[PDB]
């Protein structure tokens, strides 16, 4: 299932794949998860994250 993303918290490479640590809109921080970049439909957040780090 797809869910609204509040913000990208962190980025990493694991097993050769880029993953983003996500805060989910309306869910607590305890539910943050690492998601492979192809799970994301968050062009604006990704571009903003990759621009500010």
């Amino acid at each position: 299932e797809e869910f609204a993303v509040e913000k990208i918290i962190d980025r990493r490479v694991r097993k050769g794949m880029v993953e983003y640590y996500l805060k989910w809109k309306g869910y607590p921080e305890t539910e943050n998860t690492w998601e492979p970049e192809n799970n994301l439909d968050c062009q604006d957040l990704i571009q903003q994250y990759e621009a500010s780090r």
Partner: peptide
């Protein structure tokens, strides 16, 4: 602004 959750 969405993502698949695993």
């Amino acid at each position: 602004q969405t993502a698949r959750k695993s």
